Amino acid sequence: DEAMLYAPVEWHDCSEGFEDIRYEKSTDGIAKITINRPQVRNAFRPLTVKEMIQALADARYDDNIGVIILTGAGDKAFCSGGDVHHLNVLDFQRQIRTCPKPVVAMVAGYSIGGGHVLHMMCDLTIAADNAIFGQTGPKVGSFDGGWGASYMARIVGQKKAREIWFLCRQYDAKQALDMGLVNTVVPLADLEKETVRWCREMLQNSPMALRCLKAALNADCDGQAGLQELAGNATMLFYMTEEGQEGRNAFNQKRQPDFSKFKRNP
Amino acid sequence: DEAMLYAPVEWHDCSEGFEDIRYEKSTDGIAKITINRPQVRNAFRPLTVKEMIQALADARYDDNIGVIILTGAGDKAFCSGGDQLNVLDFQRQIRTCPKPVVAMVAGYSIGGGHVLHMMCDLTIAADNAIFGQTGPKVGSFDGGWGASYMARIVGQKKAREIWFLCRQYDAKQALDMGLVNTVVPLADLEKETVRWCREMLQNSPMALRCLKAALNADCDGQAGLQELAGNATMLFYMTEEGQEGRNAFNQKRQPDFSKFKRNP
Amino acid sequence: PDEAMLYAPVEWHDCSEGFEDIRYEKSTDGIAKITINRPQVRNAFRPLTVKEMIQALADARYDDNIGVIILTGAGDKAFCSGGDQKHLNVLDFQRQIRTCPKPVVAMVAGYSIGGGHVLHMMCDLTIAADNAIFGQTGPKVGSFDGGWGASYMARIVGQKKAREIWFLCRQYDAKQALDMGLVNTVVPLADLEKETVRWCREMLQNSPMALRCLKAALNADCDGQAGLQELAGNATMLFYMTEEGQEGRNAFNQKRQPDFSKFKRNP
Amino acid sequence: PDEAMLYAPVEWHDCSEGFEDIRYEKSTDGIAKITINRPQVRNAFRPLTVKEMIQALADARYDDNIGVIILTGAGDKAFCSGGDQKVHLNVLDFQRQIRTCPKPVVAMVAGYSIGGGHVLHMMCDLTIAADNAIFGQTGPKVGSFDGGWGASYMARIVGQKKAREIWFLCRQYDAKQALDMGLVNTVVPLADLEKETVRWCREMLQNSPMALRCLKAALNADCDGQAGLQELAGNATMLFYMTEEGQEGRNAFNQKRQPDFSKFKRNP
Amino acid sequence: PDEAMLYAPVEWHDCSEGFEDIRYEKSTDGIAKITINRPQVRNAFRPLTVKEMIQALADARYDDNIGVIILTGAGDKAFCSGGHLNVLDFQRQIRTCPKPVVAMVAGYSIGGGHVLHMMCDLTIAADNAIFGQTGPKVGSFDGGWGASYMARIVGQKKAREIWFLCRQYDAKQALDMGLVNTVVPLADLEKETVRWCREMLQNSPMALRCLKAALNADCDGQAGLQELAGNATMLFYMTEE
Amino acid sequence: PDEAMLYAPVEWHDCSEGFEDIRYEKSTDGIAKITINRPQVRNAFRPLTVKEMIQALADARYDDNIGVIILTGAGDKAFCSGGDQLNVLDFQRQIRTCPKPVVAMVAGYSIGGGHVLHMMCDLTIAADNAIFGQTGPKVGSFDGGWGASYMARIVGQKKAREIWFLCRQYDAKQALDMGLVNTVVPLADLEKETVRWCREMLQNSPMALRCLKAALNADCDGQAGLQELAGNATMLFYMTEEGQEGRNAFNQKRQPDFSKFKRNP
Ligand SMILES: [Cl-]
Ligand SMILES: [Cl-]
Ligand SMILES: [Cl-]
Ligand SMILES: [Cl-]
Ligand SMILES: [Cl-]
């Protein structure tokens, strides 16, 4: 029901100690990480990355948080790229990837360079009608050949991925939507309103199912590292079953686990 | 020529012994498996899956059948999912079937029913078709082909949206994201599906099975290699060099491969 | 588990009714044994043999009292010498062994050759008698198995040995097979079933759910999305056995919207 | 966007000497153009054509003045209509050569790109299509198939549903259909085909050639398993040689001493 | 190089401040050693132990004086006998650490403790080392790197045997199946381990990280590509272009 | 395969014309031998050497009388000690996609780039004096391509990391025990045994061998492997009736008619 989904959002500030970002949590379980350097179009420097890593780790471990929003301060930029070590954004990438909660990129204005890869790493992207996308690597002597390349191809296909990287053009919201680069385009004024609705729709669903599916979708891409995530959830599920608990109920008691009492399914 | 492609279809019933499905065969080589529980929007129960497996196995082994259509009875549902895990076997069976399998979708293709249409090689959708998953809404998920293979169809952003929110999508939305192959008016659903089937029936069945195996091989690792190499082995038996081994068994001697060219 | 239990006698009960080419037996303690029974032709399989093995394996899969399957050949001279020299449904049998959620053990005496060699490789484990002989013959007789027979063989013995085995088609004795990691152990011929049964019993003492998940996980390193289907399929099954997994179905029995808000959102 | 420079006239120099089936030209600003020149048979390739295209592509690859390659067909009616029916599977070698070419390869498509000719445009990094371009496979209609990059890689472009449709039915698709499914990068009026193609080439020419080759290798690496890793790691090895730490090994030869890596930072 | 250098005494400096479950030490010549220090429970890890190992490993990663990490257990009887699920984080961290990590194994490496040694790039085993999984025996499993990556070490037949039966394997059995890199007498365990570390320390650290990433890339799909391309990007920055 | 045939003398014919760095020879019974001929520098390759090996291998590939290729070094002391102190990557691809078995015949040193070359060969026959290992990290270099990943598919991940990270040397027995080479023979019998192995493969179906080589590469090479494997499937298809119906329908004017062919399960 739209009334619930479009209800006002009550944000509580958790930004204490952060210089480059704001970090907020809603009552209903949304964490928002906001890059707060609009003076440089929300470009990240190594400190920014360190803070985002801290905030994301906090959101991950907070049982009241079910969904994370990543965004930039103001209306003009999500993140315009690189401005605690030089390439620690790779760590942040892996952390978004393996976060068992959906991460949503909320994009107004520029999502460019390293900043473009960040939105792609997020599970979903909600774009304002003023959003601008693209890579800049080859123009400025750099490249992201990791998830920035391969994973981009799993989103827009190999022809578009080569075009995006090789020419380093800019793409508006409609172009991004048509190639499947973003999930939806909404008027700028409604950007948070629609993003929050999408978040709430996910919050109504099973968090265990979401994490299993996220791991399964990563598993199509990440080889054994994906298997680690998917199997890791299987192991966790197993512990919540009787057969899984029989080991712990037994083996502590130096006796012996007895699995004979369990069905051997087809 | 359209007159051939849009010619009437002569269906013969082969439904004997089936409770949940109809199974029919056309003269020109199309097998049609129809989920027949419209009273529950064509949801499958385990018996339904067992029968579909039987019908598909039959269609696979019938040398007169070149293409299979999977569909639901009536206009309101293709399949609305599991009834409120042998469907995994049915999935693998659709996957490794050496003949093209076409999902013919009217109304709802939802949940386990949505995965079934995705598993089919092609999907022909009526303008009233509705698509989506429900797993996370009802405490379940398909993290197998229902996730990874979905991503190979619509891309990772859309796949995550479809699974994480569990919304419904109409025919046009499905077409735009590449989830279905075409959208036709409901009244023409079988007419157009049959035309697509006939177009494939005019082509080389060996070529089709090799290509199907090759396309699965981009997804299914060694299991895909088993399919692809399996066809290679079959092709090899149909060649002179491949027959020299068997003929050497007959003539009570050693095979002699020296008489064969060693190509670049 | 104590040797007295592991080496206790075995009581096979016949379930071979209607089978021409195979014997099919089940033990009280949960072992199913499928025995190719054409020792006159060194246990070569013909299409009927494959059809019967498929039936027996499907039966063992669906029997909740069965935890482990043994695949073997009648007599001491051959496990299986390949396809009958006198269509390709053995590929179906391969996929069936692969996706069987219970451990399948190849018990090999004498020849495991050609299609018969691929069969033992497909099995999760191989217990070999000291008289066992292994190898491929494809290139010698105008054929090949480039599926699991090639790729999966490489995942067992490595790419150099896999190329040697296929390209030359030599034979390898039990010790050579053991040294290259092709079989799990070598035992005297007289103790073949005794030791095989012990290995089966050791697995039977363990969690069947853990075994199926691990089997699926190990296949997943090889079988791309087909492996993900197996692994995720177990995850789905596990999920149904949890409270959160049941809430969906209970919201149906009790006629209400599901409420997942009452569940923890773990890290 | 300096359209003045992106739409400046192109100065082509002929390098076709000794070629029977193709034209081969190079521009002053670094574009090589390989043109299949058999328009009487809709630019179908025979084995000689493939051999010549392989030679021309190898030349373009080794020419440091060349940054981008255009692959196209003579005239307006066909890019390439496939293998010559009236006649070597050496087109597979050409495929692998396009794939591993460390420079962007651009398919410039007018009229028919069909069969083997359709796979060729797909192998190219980008495809610029005229509004009259026609696409599709024919394998299953004429007892053949491309189950290699023609299948798997097609799927990485248009998705698995469309890939199966394209192969199983062997229909033809017009430029707009190709664009909508992501099969080509852009559709332009026929009269502007080379003008726009050259603009795209020049935009790439303005960028770092090392970055382009690394990215091309990285994108292939999502598809080509260890063969992809060979390309990607190969560029890493090349980059390493251009660094001080990479040169210390070679210099420890020149000054006759053991290499000393202790003087280098051990980064996180 | 020369054995006198490789077998020279090792000067350890303690960096264990604030740790309850582990010792953490650094040598002058660039080796960091993380020691699980719960020998009473055969060096089993609890969640705190994992948290501390994660901290120590992050520290070693960011210390430019450190070229190689040793992971080991206190005493002679156990490397680690096994076990919220934060050990998965530790696994990824060992995996993506751009410096070689060496498991130095005395006595038991079992269960989760067995997976940890496998995750390390190399394993130096004492003649008394014992290896194996226990998952299926105690209602658990590691179907991630504990399964697939194990297969990439010992082959699919042995990996299935190890997991399905959950037996124990002695040092010689582990060596024969390629599970460990070498077996040395217990009394020489650290001496030989330190030698292996010093041999790596003599080599190019950039080469080592690129190779480690390349070897992971054969296993880890796009995550492996991220590591490998990441190094390429880093190299690119060090060039004129 | 009776030993008298397998151990019969080998009649080599020289085809080295125009080569500076290599010898290239062919036997009557279908073996091509490429020999790196710079024993003064332990058979290290320089770019010219690679160019010549590429030419010789391309020739062997296109010679229908050749079924198997031996790659080796002149003398007894070295197979190849690596790059001379990047076209070798092309030579690697070329060994990889050569539809005929390539056998590394290794005496003495196979080191660095020279160690990767033996690994790329389908099989390796090693003399009891053979020495193996990488040197990259010692001399500021690395091979992170097939030199890494494919090495792991041979000896496993633990041994691969050891070989690369430490850059030690390994003798024949160590190489055999880790599965790095296929067999170790006395130095004096190196060619005798290598030729036997070649002859054993020469007795087998060359189509089967190329399909299997492609299938084994396919476990490693993603879509590039699929290209090889499907390429053979396409070739096989052309040799069948159903495959020829397309071509026969063009050269007879008509539409192809596939209805007359069975639709197998
Ligand atoms: Cl010609
Ligand atoms: Cl604690
Ligand atoms: Cl405490
Ligand atoms: Cl392996
Ligand atoms: Cl791979």
Pairing label, strands E68-73, A67-72: unpaired
Residues 6+ apart with CB under 8 A from E65: D266, E26, E30
Amino acid at residue number A8:
P
For residue C163 the two structure tokens come to 């190329």
CA distance D227 to E222: 15
Residues D108 and D187 placed together within one structural domain of the fold? yes
Q: Point out the residue among A142, A226, A229 whose CB comes nearest to the CB of E233.
A: A142
Residues A118 and A158 placed together within one structural domain of the fold? yes
Residues D25 and D103 placed together within one structural domain of the fold? yes
Q: Does any domain span residue D46?
A: yes
Q: What is each CA distance from B248 to B240, C169, F262, in whole angstroms?
A: 12, 17, 26
CA angle A238, A242, A248 (to 5 degrees): 80
The distance of C117 to chain B (nearest Cα, Å) reads 16
SS in 3 state form for B75-88? CCEEECCECCCCHH
Residues 6+ apart with CB under 8 A from A181: A120, A125, A133, A155, A156, A171, B157
Amino acid at residue number B200:
M
The answer to whether F75 and F112 have CB atoms below 8 angstroms apart is no
Residue entry with tokens 């270099």: F141
Q: 213-232 in C: which are within 8 Å (CB) of A?
A: 213, 217, 220-221, 225, 228, 231-232
List of chain F residues whose C-beta atoms are within 8 Å of the C-beta of residue B218: 223, 226
CA distance F241 to F260: 11
Is there a contact between F237 and B64 if contact means CB atoms under 8 Å apart? no
Pairing label, strands E78-80, E108-110: parallel
Q: Does any domain span residue D267?
A: no
Is there a contact between B144 and A216 if contact means CB atoms under 8 Å apart? yes
Resolution (A): 2.3
Give the H or E element holding residue B113: helix B112-119
List of chain A residues whose C-beta atoms are within 8 Å of the C-beta of residue E149: 224
CATH number at residue B219: 1.10.12.10
Q: Quote the ligand 4 centre to C154 CA distance (angstroms).
A: 6
Amino acid at residue number A254:
K
Of A85, A95, A86, nearest in space to A118 by CA = A95
Give the H or E element holding residue A244: helix A242-251
The answer to whether C23 and C60 have CB atoms below 8 angstroms apart is no
C242 Ramachandran zone, left/alpha/beta (phi>0; psi -120 to 50): beta
Of F106, F135, F133, F101, nearest in space to F118 by CA = F106
Q: Where are the beta strands (DSSP E) in chain F?
A: 12-14, 22-27, 31-36, 68-73, 78-80, 102-106, 109-111, 123-127, 131-133, 170-171, 183-185
Q: Does any domain span residue C129?
A: yes
The annotation status of E133 as a binding-site residue, yes or no, is yes
CA distance E69 to E208: 13
* Helix residue spans in E19-138 (DSSP H): 47-62, 87-96, 112-119
DSSP letter at E221 equals H
List of chain F residues whose C-beta atoms are within 8 Å of the C-beta of residue E154: 156
The answer to whether B34 and B24 have CB atoms below 8 angstroms apart is yes
The answer to whether F163 and F179 have CB atoms below 8 angstroms apart is no
Give the H or E element holding residue E108: strand E108-110
The answer to whether E68 and E31 have CB atoms below 8 angstroms apart is yes
Instruction: Count H helices and E strands in chain D, helices first.
Output: 11, 11
The answer to whether C184 and C127 have CB atoms below 8 angstroms apart is yes
Residues 6+ apart with CB under 8 A from C141: B245, B246, B248, B249, B255, C114
Query: How many C/F residue pairs have CB atoms within 8 Å?
Result: 90
Residues D29 and D59 placed together within one structural domain of the fold? yes
Residues F44 and F129 placed together within one structural domain of the fold? yes
Q: Does any domain span residue C75?
A: yes
Q: Is the dihedral of CA E38, E44, E47, E51 positive or negative?
A: positive
The answer to whether A137 and E131 have CB atoms below 8 angstroms apart is no
Q: Does any domain span residue C267?
A: no
The order of strands in the sheet holding C68-73 is C12-14, C22-27, C31-36, C68-73, C104-108, C125-129, C185-187
Give the residue from B160, B175, B222 with the most A CB atoms within 10 Å of its CB, the best one to mutate: B160
Is there a contact between F231 and D92 if contact means CB atoms under 8 Å apart? yes
Q: What is each CA distance from F175 to C122, F115, F159, F169, in whole angstroms?
A: 28, 12, 11, 10
CA angle B4, B10, B16 (to 5 degrees): 150
Of E56, E168, E210, E181, nearest in space to E117 by CA = E181
Pairing label, strands C133-135, C172-173: antiparallel
Instruction: Count H helices and E strands in chain B, helices first.
Output: 11, 11
Is there a contact between C248 and B96 if contact means CB atoms under 8 Å apart? no
At C72, phi and psi to the nearest 5? -155, 175
CA distance E183 to E172: 7
The order of strands in the sheet holding D78-80 is D78-80, D112-114, D134-136, D173-174
At D167, phi and psi to the nearest 5? -75, -45
Amino acid at residue number B137:
K
Our answer on whether B and A touch (3+ beta-carbon pairs < 8 Å) is yes
Amino acid at residue number A230:
L
- β-partners of residue F103 are F70, F123
Q: Quote the ligand 2 centre to E36 CA distance (angstroms).
A: 14
Residues 6+ apart with CB under 8 A from B106: B71, B72, B74, B75, B76, B77, B78, B126, B128, B129, B186, B189
CA distance E211 to F147: 10
Residue entry with tokens 């190969």: D234
Q: D268 and chain A: CB distance < 8 Å anywhere?
A: yes
Residues A61 and A148 placed together within one structural domain of the fold? yes
Q: What is each CA distance from B96 to A56, A199, B57, B231, C221, in whole angstroms?
A: 42, 38, 11, 12, 20
Q: What is each CA distance from D7 to C177, C265, D1, D3, D4, in whole angstroms?
A: 68, 57, 11, 6, 5
Torsion angle in degrees (nearest 10) through CA of A64, A66, A71, A74: -50
Give the residue from F201, F204, F236, F254 with the most B CB atoms within 10 Å of its CB, the best one to mutate: F236
The distance of A10 to chain C (nearest Cα, Å) reads 18
At E143, phi and psi to the nearest 5? -100, 10
Q: What is each CA distance from B170 to B106, B107, B125, in whole angstroms?
A: 11, 9, 10
List of chain F residues whose C-beta atoms are within 8 Å of the C-beta of residue B66: 263
CA distance F43 to F72: 9
Residues 6+ apart with CB under 8 A from E118: E145, E146, E149, E150, E153, E179
The C-alpha R_g of chain F, in whole angstroms, comes to 21
CA distance F96 to F54: 12
DSSP string, E112-177: HHHHHHHHSSEEEEETT-EEE--GGGTT----STTTHHHHHHH-HHHHHHHHHH---EEHHHHHHT
For residue C160 the two structure tokens come to 């150099």
- Helix axis angle for F222-238 and D225-241, nearest 10°, is 130
CA distance F180 to F197: 17
For residues D256-266, one letter each, b for 16 or more C-beta atoms within 10 angstroms of the residue's C-beta and e for the rest, the string is: eeebebeebeb
Domain count across chain A: 2
Q: What technique solved it?
A: X-ray
Of A58, A40, A47, nearest in space to A20 by CA = A47
List of chain E residues whose C-beta atoms are within 8 Å of the C-beta of residue D265: 64
CA distance A77 to E201: 45
The answer to whether A197 and A6 have CB atoms below 8 angstroms apart is yes
- Helix axis angle for D225-241 and D244-254, nearest 10°, is 70
The answer to whether C134 and C172 have CB atoms below 8 angstroms apart is yes
CA distance F132 to F122: 16
Q: B92 and chain A: CB distance < 8 Å anywhere?
A: no
Q: Quote the ligand 3 centre to C81 CA distance (angstroms).
A: 62
Q: Is B108 helix (H, G, I), strand (E, B) or coil?
A: strand
CA distance B28 to B65: 8
Residues F139 and F13 placed together within one structural domain of the fold? yes
Name the closest residue on chain B to residue A198, using Cα atoms.
B165
The annotation status of A81 as a binding-site residue, yes or no, is yes
For residue F234 the two structure tokens come to 């396409």
The answer to whether A97 and A155 have CB atoms below 8 angstroms apart is no
The answer to whether C181 and E154 have CB atoms below 8 angstroms apart is yes
At E81, phi and psi to the nearest 5? -95, 10
Residues 6+ apart with CB under 8 A from B114: B81, B131, B132, B133, B146
Pairing label, strands F31-36, F22-27: antiparallel
Any idea which ligand is nearest the CA of D88? Answer: 1
Our answer on whether C and D touch (3+ beta-carbon pairs < 8 Å) is no
DSSP string, D47-102: HHHHHHHHHHHHHHHH-TT--EEEEEESSSSEEE--B-TT---THHHHHHHHHH-S
Residues D167 and D128 placed together within one structural domain of the fold? yes
For residues B91-123, one letter each, b for 16 or more C-beta atoms within 10 angstroms of the residue's C-beta and e for the rest, the string is: bbbbbbbbbbbbbbbbbbbbbbbbbbbbbbbbb
Pairing label, strands E31-36, A103-107: unpaired
For residue D147 the two structure tokens come to 């189950």
CA distance C43 to A8: 74
Q: Is the dihedral of CA C33, C39, C41, C46 positive or negative?
A: negative
CA distance E24 to E61: 13
Name the closest residue on chain A to residue E89, using Cα atoms.
A98
Residues C85 and C198 placed together within one structural domain of the fold? yes
The answer to whether A180 and A154 have CB atoms below 8 angstroms apart is no
The C-alpha R_g of chain A, in whole angstroms, comes to 21
Q: What is each CA distance from D34 to B145, D216, F122, in whole angstroms?
A: 42, 20, 36
For residue A8 the two structure tokens come to 């006002």
Of D89, D58, D56, nearest in space to F51 by CA = D58
Q: Quote the ligand 3 centre to E40 CA distance (angstroms).
A: 16
Q: Quote the ligand 2 centre to C116 CA distance (angstroms).
A: 53
Q: Does any domain span residue A265?
A: no
The answer to whether F139 and D249 have CB atoms below 8 angstroms apart is yes
List of chain F residues whose C-beta atoms are within 8 Å of the C-beta of residue E219: 157
Name the closest residue on chain C to residue A207, using Cα atoms.
C265
The answer to whether C103 and E164 have CB atoms below 8 angstroms apart is yes
Q: 144-203 in F: which are within 8 Å (CB) of D?
A: 144-150
Of E219, F145, E205, E95, nearest in space to A94 by CA = E95
Pairing label, strands D134-136, E12-14: unpaired
Specify binding-site residues of F for substrate: 42, 81-85, 109-113, 135, 141, 238, 253
D42 Ramachandran zone, left/alpha/beta (phi>0; psi -120 to 50): left
Of F137, F140, F154, nearest in space to F219 by CA = F154
* Helix residue spans in F84-221 (DSSP H): 88-97, 113-120, 149-155, 157-166, 172-177, 190-202, 206-218
SS in 3 state form for chain C? CCHHHHCCCCCEEECCCCCCCEEEEEECCCEEEEEECCHHHCCCECHHHHHHHHHHHHHHHHCCCCCEEEEEECCCCEEECCECCCCCCHHHHHHHHHHCCCCEEEEECCEEECHHHHHHHHCCEEEEECCCEEECCHHHCCCCCCCCCCHHHHHHHCHHHHHHHHHHCCCEEHHHHHHCCCCCEEECHHHHHHHHHHHHHHHHCCCHHHHHHHHHHHHHCCCHHHHHHHHHHHHHHHHHCCHHHHHHHHHHHCCCCCCCCCCCCCC
Q: Does any domain span residue E68?
A: yes
Is there a contact between B257 and F203 if contact means CB atoms under 8 Å apart? yes
CA distance A12 to A30: 10
CATH number at residue C68: 3.90.226.10
Q: What is each CA distance from E68 to D173, D261, E209, in whole angstroms?
A: 58, 14, 11
CA distance C231 to C161: 29
The answer to whether E63 and E157 have CB atoms below 8 angstroms apart is no
Residues B105 and B215 placed together within one structural domain of the fold? no
Q: Where are the beta strands (DSSP E) in chain D?
A: 12-14, 22-27, 31-36, 68-73, 78-80, 105-109, 112-114, 126-130, 134-136, 173-174, 186-188
Q: Does any domain span residue D268?
A: no
DSSP letter at D137 equals -
Give the residue from E226, E234, E240 with the most A CB atoms within 10 Å of its CB, the best one to mutate: E226
Domain that holds residue D240: 206-254
Q: What is the biggest distance separating any 2 CA atoms in chain B, rounded to whole angstroms?
A: 67
Residues D102 and D159 placed together within one structural domain of the fold? yes
Residues A130 and A237 placed together within one structural domain of the fold? no
Give the H or E element holding residue E24: strand E22-27
The distance of B160 to chain F (nearest Cα, Å) reads 25
CA distance C147 to C98: 13
CA distance E198 to F167: 12
Is there a contact between E144 and A224 if contact means CB atoms under 8 Å apart? yes
Give the residue from D95, D229, D253 with the most F CB atoms within 10 Å of its CB, the best one to mutate: D229
CA distance C241 to A235: 13
Of D119, D114, D89, nearest in space to D170 by CA = D114
Q: Point out the residue among C202, C203, C210 whose CB comes nearest to the CB of E135.
A: C210
The answer to whether A142 and D211 have CB atoms below 8 angstroms apart is yes
Any idea which ligand is nearest the CA of E45? Answer: 2
CA distance A138 to C78: 63
Residue B259 has a CB neighbour count (10 Å cut-off) of 8
DSSP letter at B29 equals S
